[PDB]
Design a protein around this nucleic acid. Structure first.
Lengths: 148, 155, 185
RNA sequence: AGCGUGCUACUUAUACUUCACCGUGAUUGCUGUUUUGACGCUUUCACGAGUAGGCAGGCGUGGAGGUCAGUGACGAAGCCUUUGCUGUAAAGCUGGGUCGAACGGCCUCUAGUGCAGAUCUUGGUGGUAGUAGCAAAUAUUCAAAUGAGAACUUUGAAGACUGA
RNA sequence: UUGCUUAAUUGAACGUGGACAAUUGAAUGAAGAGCUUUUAGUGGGCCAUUUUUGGUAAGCAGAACUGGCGAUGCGGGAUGA
RNA sequence: GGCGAAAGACUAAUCGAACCAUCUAGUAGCUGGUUCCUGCCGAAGUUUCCCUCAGGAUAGCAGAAGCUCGUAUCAGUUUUAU
RNA sequence: GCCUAGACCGAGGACUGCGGUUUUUACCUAGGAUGUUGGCAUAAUGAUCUUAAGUCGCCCGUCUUGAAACACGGACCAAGGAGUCUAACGUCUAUGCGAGUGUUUGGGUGUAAAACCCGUACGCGUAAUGAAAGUGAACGAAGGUGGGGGCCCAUUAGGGUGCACCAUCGACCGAUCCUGAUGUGUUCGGAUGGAUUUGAGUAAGAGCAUAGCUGUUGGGACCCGAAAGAUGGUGAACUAUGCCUG
RNA sequence: GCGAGAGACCGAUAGCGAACAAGUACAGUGAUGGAAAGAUGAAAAGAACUUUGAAAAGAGAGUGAAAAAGUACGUGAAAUUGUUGAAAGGGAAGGGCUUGAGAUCAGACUUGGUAUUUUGCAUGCUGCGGUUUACCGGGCCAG
C-alpha cells in the first residue's frame, strides 16, 4: 500500500529524505557492477571474495541428468517403508523375511550412512551406497542389493 | 463523531475531608473599645467615629455618634479603618445587646434601632463633653492635605 | 539544564506485548499477565516473555529435543513446556511417555505423542495443572541453526557464508578464495 | 557620568528553587468487586534544544468491500462570512447568506492522494499608466448638401503638389 | 593425565579432592549489563584558548588537544555564526 | 553534400556541417525543484582504495528492531604499586 | 527562641498513613482551602476581531564554513505539478503448514475473468566437498570443561538437573600432504595410522509459501535540463556558381 | 479491420491530438507541425406591449419554480476593480506579546426544587409551560 510508505511521510520536507548536500542524482558510482576492480574494489574484496578469475575446467554441453543422484541417509531409510506396515515390520522382521526398501523407486540415487538404524534386518535396493552405509546395514543383519 | 462510552461515569465524587478548622480572629493592638477611628471607605469615608464593640462577625460596632456626625450605629471592617490614638471612656456605654442578628437584613428605619441610637448617644455625648474640642474633632471630616505623608504621620 | 550521563527517553528495547493480533494468543497473555503479576513464581514471568517473541525467536522444537530432555536425571516425569511449535522427527527410534505443553503441534508431532501414551496439552491447560509451573522443564529450539545466521558478520577470515544466489565453480571461488589466484581471505 | 581600588544596596535570562498543566520514558497496583474497556485504569519519579536523517502516532483527498433500514428538492454538494465551538496542530463541526442534486460518518481496502517557489505548465489579472507615444513623404481653407452627429463623406470655389 | 620435557619420580599444561564468605581483599559513580541484525545522512568544514610549521605579515596557508559554530534560540558584549 | 574571384562564405531571417521526423523520456559524478501535522531520538565533513580531487566504495558517527540476562562486572575519574 | 509586615498559589476529592493532644474508639495545625459577607445575573466576567500605545521583530526558498545580503528564483491569482510500477533479491515482522512446502502451467466445476475442487511433475528445503574423477557425516547417553534462565531437593545459603546461547578442547565427512595391510589383469587396490593444512560441513533437521515496511540492482526509474551521435527524408521561391533564352 | 461485453480506469488544463463542422482552424516552399472550444430551462415559455433614445440600449411590463437562469446563460472562487460603510496614516507596510477602546459572541437563578393564584388542551380533576413576593439552595464576581 502506498499509504504506509515513507513517501507519504516525506511530503513537506524538501529533500524527500535524500539529503541537501548529497543531492540524490542519477547514477553516482556507475551502473550495475561498474568499477568492481577500480572504485568498488573495497566492497567486492570484503563481501564477495573469489569474484574475479577462472577456476577449473570447462564442461561443454553439460547434461545435468547424468549427475542426478539424490541422497538418502540411514536415519531416514525407514520412512520409505509403507507407513501402515512399519510397526508390524519393525517387530517380526528376521533374516527369513525382511522388508525390502527400493530407494530408486522413491527417487534416490545413493544411500549414505548418517544416523543409526533400528536393530532390524532390511533388504536395501540402491544404485549406490557409501562404504559406511553398507557396513551399518549388514551390522543389523541386512544386505544391500545393487540395482540399475 | 466520537460517541460516549459506557465507562464514562457521570457520578460526582464526594469531597475529601478538609482539615481547615477556623480559628478566632486577631485584632490589632490599636483597636481598643472607645478609640476614635477614621473610616477610609464606604458612604461615610473620612468620618471620625467611636469604636464600641468587637462583634463576632469579625467586624467592629461603631457609632458616630449620630447627633455629632450623622453616622449611626453600624458595623465596619477592621481593615477599612485607621485606628487613631485618641480614646473615649466607653465603660458607661451599654453595647451588650448588639450582636450579629441585630444587624441581620430584614427608607423606613426601625423604631427600636433609633431608640438604641439615642440611648447610646446619651452616654457617649456625656463622656465626650469632658475632653475639650473632642466634639468639634468628631464632627469634622478627615482628609489628606498637600504634603501629608501617611507613612510619617501618627494617628 | 542537565548534564545527561545517558541518553534520554530511551525505550527498554524489549517487547512488552505480542506484535501478533491473534485474539487467542492475547487470551494467553491475559492469563499469564495475571499469573506473572499475582503469583511471584519465576516460571510465570518467563512464559509471559516468551509469548511476546517473534517467529524466528521461537524456533520449532523437534520431538527429539523433548526426548533428550526427558532423559536428564530425574526429568522423566517433568512437564515439558514449549512456547512454540512441536514438530515430528522421523529419525527417532522410540519416544517415551510424557506430557508436553505447547502452543502448536504438527500433525506428526501430536500423533507420536499420543501413540506412545503421552498427552499433548495447550498452555492454558498447563495453568490449571501447574499454576506455578511446578515440575516443569522449558525447552527452546536452536536459534543459530537458521539459514540467515550463516551470513551474519561475513568478512575476511570469519568463516561465514557469502550472500550468493548460485553455487558452483564459477561463483566466487577464484580471487580471494584461492592462493593460486592471488590471495586467500 | 574619566582612571586605579574597596564596600553596601539594588536591576534582571528561556538558568536555579517551589508549585500547576502537557507529553515522553521508567515505575506501583488492579480478576472469589472483572464490573459490558487489561491495546485499559492506576501510583510514583525523572526528563523535554535541534539541521541532515531515522522511527512512531495522527489529520486530509479520489475510488473499493461492509455497516449506519445514515443526511437530502421541507434543499445534497459547492461558495462567502468578527456566528461560533473543538483539537498543541494537521483539521473537524456549526450560525447566517447563496445554490439546486446528490452526499457523508464509522470498520477495512486501494492510489495518478496534500504545493509557495522549479528563469515550473496552462489560463487569467495588475502596477507601470490614461503613461511612452500616435512627429519622414511642402498644405490646406470656405461654403453647401447628406446626416442624430461632419477636421476626415459628396459637390462647388480656391490654394497646392507629383512635374512625362 | 601426556606421545611434550627432565639424569630423574623433574617439570609444563589441564584437573580430582580439601580450606579460606560478605572488608571476596582501594576510592567514587552506575536511567543496568552484554549481544546482534539492518539501514539513513555524511565523507567542501570553520572559529576560540593553548602548543606549533611556512611566511614581513595577513580576517594567510598547514598541523596537535579540547571546546564551540555548523545544527542554537535566550541574558550580556550598542551592532556581530 | 553542393557552390565558393576564398570570407569558413553561402546553401529559404538556420551554417566551423541545413531543415524535418524518428531512434529518444539519449546520457549527465553538474544546476534547479521536490507538496500535511505532532512526538521521540539525532549526525558528519574523518580512515583506506579508486584516471581519485564537484564522485563513489569502505570503516566511523545515527536511527530502528530488538534479543540474553537483572547489578553481573563496568567507567573520557581519582588513589596505591609498578 | 519570640513578636511582626507583605506577595504568589489552593493541585487533590468517601475512609485508610505518620505523628501530636489525650481531658477520648475523641480531637488536632498531622498524606494539597475552607468559613463568612456583599453585589450581579438586561449584567460583574471571559474570548475573538479591528485599532492605539509600549517593546521586540531584516525576505522567504536555496547552495553554503558563513545570506537581510550589493548571491540566485520569486509581479499576482487559480488549476495542474515531482521516489512510481515491475523482475530478481537482503534484513525484519505477521500468517498457514512444517521435514516438508507451494491449488491457480493445466484439468474439473461454476451463480462465469470470481468462488470452489484436483493432481503429476517441478522449484526450494532435507548433505557436503573437490577443478575433476569421485567420495560422502555417532568412540561415548551425539562428547568434555567453565558459565547459563528455569525446574527439583534445601532451610540464608547450598546441592542436583541444566534448554537457548557464549568461550574452549575434541570426534565425524570432503579436499590437500604423509603412511602403505590382506591382495593383484604387476600396476592396480587402499586397510590402518597421522598432519602448525583446508571447506559456505556433521554433531536429534527449519524450511516452504503469501503479505507488508525498508534497502539493493536493471529498467525512462523522483521531476525538468545539454553540447552531441544515428536512420530515413525535404528544400537552390533567399543565396552561391554554370548553362539556355530575353 | 469488423462485431460485442466489461472495469477498485479518466471526468473537459484529465482521458486519444480530437466528448464540439479535429487531423478541423491556422503556420510552413516543403518534408511536416497543429490548437482552442461541453453544461439556460422541464419546456423558448428566447422577453409581446408602453416609454426615453439616431441606434445599441435603458426603464417599466411580461414568461418562468427561479431572470440571484436572458443565449456576454448551471454554480460563479481568487487575483483585480467599483460604490458604500468603518478605521488608520510625519521618508514603507505587514508580525508577535500586553493591555486599553469600539464591535461581536458566550454564559446558571440550572430542565432549580417548596405551597400558591389565574391563561391554556383533547378530555372524566389528571401530565404540565403561566405569575409575584415568601423560604431553601445554587451560579458568577469581589471583600
Amino acid at each position: 500500500p502506498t499509504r504506509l510508505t515513507k513517501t507519504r511521510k516525506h511530503r513537506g520536507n524538501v529533500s524527500a529524505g535524500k539529503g541537501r548536500i548529497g543531492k540524490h542524482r542519477k547514477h553516482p558510482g556507475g551502473r550495475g557492477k561498474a568499477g568492481g576492480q577500480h572504485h568498488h574494489r573495497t566492497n567486492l574484496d570484503k563481501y564477495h571474495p573469489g569474484y574475479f578469475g577462472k577456476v577449473g575446467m570447462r564442461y561443454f554441453h553439460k547434461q545435468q541428468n547424468h549427475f542426478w543422484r539424490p541422497e538418502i541417509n540411514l536415519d531416514k531409510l525407514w520412512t520409505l517403508v509403507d507407513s501402515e506396515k512399519k510397526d508390524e515390520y519393525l517387530s517380526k522382521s528376521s533374516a527369513s523375511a525382511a522388508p525390502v526398501i527400493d530407494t530408486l523407486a522413491h527417487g534416490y540415487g545413493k544411500v549414505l550412512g548418517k544416523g543409526r538404524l533400528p536393530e532390524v534386518p532390511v533388504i536395501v535396493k540402491a544404485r549406490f551406497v557409501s562404504k559406511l552405509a553398507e557396513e551399518k546395514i549388514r551390522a543389523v543383519g541386512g544386505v544391500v542389493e545393487l540395482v540399475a | 463523531q466520537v460517541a460516549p462510552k459506557w465507562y464514562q461515569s457521570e457520578d460526582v465524587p464526594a469531597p475529601k475531608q478538609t482539615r481547615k478548622t477556623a480559628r478566632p480572629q486577631k485584632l490589632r493592638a490599636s483597636l481598643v473599645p472607645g478609640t476614635v477611628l477614621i473610616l477610609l471607605a464606604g458612604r461615610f469615608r473620612g468620618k471620625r467615629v467611636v469604636y464600641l464593640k468587637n462583634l463576632e462577625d469579625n467586624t467592629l460596632l461603631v457609632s458616630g455618634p449620630f447627633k455629632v456626625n450623622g453616622v449611626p450605629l453600624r458595623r465596619v471592617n477592621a481593615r477599612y479603618v485607621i485606628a487613631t490614638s485618641t480614646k473615649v471612656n466607653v465603660s458607661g456605654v451599654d453595647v451588650s445587646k448588639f450582636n450579629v442578628e441585630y444587624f441581620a437584613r430584614e427608607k423606613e428605619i426601625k423604631a427600636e434601632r433609633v431608640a438604641d441610637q439615642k440611648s447610646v448617644d446619651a452616654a457617649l455625648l456625656s463622656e465626650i463633653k469632658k475632653t475639650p474640642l473632642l466634639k468639634q474633632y468628631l464632627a469634622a471630616s478627615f482628609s489628606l492635605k498637600n504634603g501629608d505623608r501617611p507613612h510619617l504621620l501618627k494617628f | 539544564g542537565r548534564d545527561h550521563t545517558s541518553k534520554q527517553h530511551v525505550r527498554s528495547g524489549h517487547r512488552t506485548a505480542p506484535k501478533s493480533d491473534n485474539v487467542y494468543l492475547q487470551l494467553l497473555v491475559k492469563l499469564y499477565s495475571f499469573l506473572a503479576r499475582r503469583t511471584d513464581a519465576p516460571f510465570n514471568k518467563v512464559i509471559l516473555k516468551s509469548l511476546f517473541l517473534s517467529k524466528i525467536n521461537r524456533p520449532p522444537v523437534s520431538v527429539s529435543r523433548i526426548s533428550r530432555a526427558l532423559k536428564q536425571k530425574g526429568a522423566a516425569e517433568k512437564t515439558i513446556v514449549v512456547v512454540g511449535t512441536v514438530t515430528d522427527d522421523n529419525r527417532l527410534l522410540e519416544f517415551p511417555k510424557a506430557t508436553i505443553a505447547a502452543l502448536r503441534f504438527t500433525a506428526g508431532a501430536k500423533d507420536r505423542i499420543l501413540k506412545n501414551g503421552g498427552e499433548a496439552i495447550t498452555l492454558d491447560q498447563l495453568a490449571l495443572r501447574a499454576p506455578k509451573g511446578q515440575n516443569t522443564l522449558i525447552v527452546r529450539g536452536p536459534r543459530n541453526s537458521r539459514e540467515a545466521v550463516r551470513h551474519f558478520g561475513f568478512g575476511p577470515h570469519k568463516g561465514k557464508a557469502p550472500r550468493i544466489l548460485s553455487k558452483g565453480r564459477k561463483f566466487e571461488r577464484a580471487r580471494g578464495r584461492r592462493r593460486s589466484r592471488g590471495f586467500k581471505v
